[PDB]
Amino acid sequence: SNCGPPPTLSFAAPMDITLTETRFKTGTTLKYTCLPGYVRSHSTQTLTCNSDGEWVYNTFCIYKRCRHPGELRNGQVEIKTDLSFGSQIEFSCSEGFFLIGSTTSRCEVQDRGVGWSHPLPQCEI
Amino acid sequence: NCGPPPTLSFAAPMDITLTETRFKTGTTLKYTCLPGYVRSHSTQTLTCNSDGEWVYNTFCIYKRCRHPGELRNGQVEIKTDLSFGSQIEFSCSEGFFLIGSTTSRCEVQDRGVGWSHPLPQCEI
Amino acid sequence: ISQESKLINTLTDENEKLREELQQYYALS
Amino acid sequence: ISQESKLINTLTDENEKLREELQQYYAL
Secondary structure, three states: EEOOOOOOOOOOEEEEOOOOOOOOOOOOEEEEOOOOOEEEEEEEOOOEOOOOOOEOOOEEEEEOOOOOOOOOOEEEEEOOOEOOOOEEEEEEEEEOOEEEEEOOEEEEEEOOOEEOOOOOOOEEE | OEEEOOOOOOEEEEOOOOOOOOEOOOEEEEEOOOOOHHHHHHHOEEEEEOOOOEOOOOEEEEOOOOOOOOOOOOEOOOOOOOEEEEEEEEOOOOOOOEEEEEEEEEEEEEEEEEEEOOOOOOEE | HHHHHHHHHHHHHHHHHHHHHHHHHOOOO | HHHHHHHHHHHHHHHHHHHHHHHHHHHO
């Protein structure tokens, strides 16, 4: 019965905020749901009370928007919709430049953030 | 041993019962955001510290104008951003005549912020 | 392509609305 | 031309932080 109320998280909220119990037994799990603007990153969306009365979790929701990958020297990075999770951008080269690497990239779940499936290609020769 | 509180680029003191001329170290005065700015922080105070200087964190920031849209057969250039004070420029392609302004400023408009000049046209 | 500007406006408006929301918290001081 | 990309990133980062900021106040 070592854990107190769970911390407030930037990415998730508790499902069922009733309970009102101020102390939680070692081992109890609380189910969480992503706050708006965040996407599910892991299967397990829980907080667990461990032996030392701290809540243990990984970051299981992440901010949904990727950043713009930058300028494509000798070519073009085109937004099709936005830069949000799931969305895709396309790369093309101008003139007669040969594009090496990927022609598209999707904003996808990665590490402890969100990111591009493929990097910016190059436009050479 | 502080003197009267300053008006800052982004905020001015609440209560204009003017310059009671000296303030003891530790006094805090509430400020209000000047137009074109929004509250950025809970704390809107200046405090007079040991060295008789007013100390603050920055509690107001620039309001943001919106992007004005596409300029048919011309180009809209962000020089800085679209924030209060910033300027954008307009150009037309080829040999088109630009009618209207070649620039626009993000400026105070009544209770928000807005563009001094609208999108030009590119003609003939 | 107008999509760059549309995204900029989307984020600008959303941030504005969010800042207004923070304003309610500031107001309680 | 890169300024648009810079602004998008500026706004995207702000949006995330404003959302974090709101949760911090909610916690209080």
